[PDB]
Amino acid sequence: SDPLPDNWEMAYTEKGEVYFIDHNTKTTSWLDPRLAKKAKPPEECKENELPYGWEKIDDPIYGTYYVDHINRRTQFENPVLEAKRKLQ
Amino acid sequence: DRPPPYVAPPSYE
């Protein structure tokens, strides 16, 4: 399974970072559409697991935070821990 | 206070 979906391309930033180009909707995304996984409510994930689309970033200057590439959000709290906390 | 903002990929060309 190498090919991208029809009417997609992939390209690279000057920093060598891959991203994906969707000509169907005239948008770009960091997410590889070939790698999409089933959505899961955050509270239903295991302790050391993140839902699909999330990335943990450890910034030397700004510390740890979480990035949601589906909704394009960033937050300090681990989203799985947050969901469990608010529902607990 | 907030974390670094979302950094988007290059815009669609």
Q: Going from the N-terminus, what domains does chain A have, and what CATH number goes with each?
A: 1-35 (2.20.70.10), 37-88 (2.20.70.10)
Q: What is the resolution of this structure in A?
A: 1.6
Give the mutation candidate from A28, A55, A62 for the B interface (greatest B CB count, under 10 A).
A28
State the DSSP string of A29-63: ESS-GGG------GGGS-TT---TTEEEEEETTTE
Neighbours of A67 (CB within 10 A): 21
Taking CB atoms and an 8 Å cutoff, what residues of chain B touch A22?
12
Way it was determined: X-ray
Do A49 and A57 touch, CB atoms closer than 8 A? no
How near does any CA of chain A get to the CA of B13, in Å? 8
Q: Which helix (H) or strand (E) holds A83?
A: helix A79-87
Residue whose pair of structure tokens reads 């300090």 in the numeric block: A76
How near does any CA of chain B get to the CA of A45, in Å? 23
Please tell me which of the candidates B5, B6, B10 has its beta carbon nearest to residue A13: B10
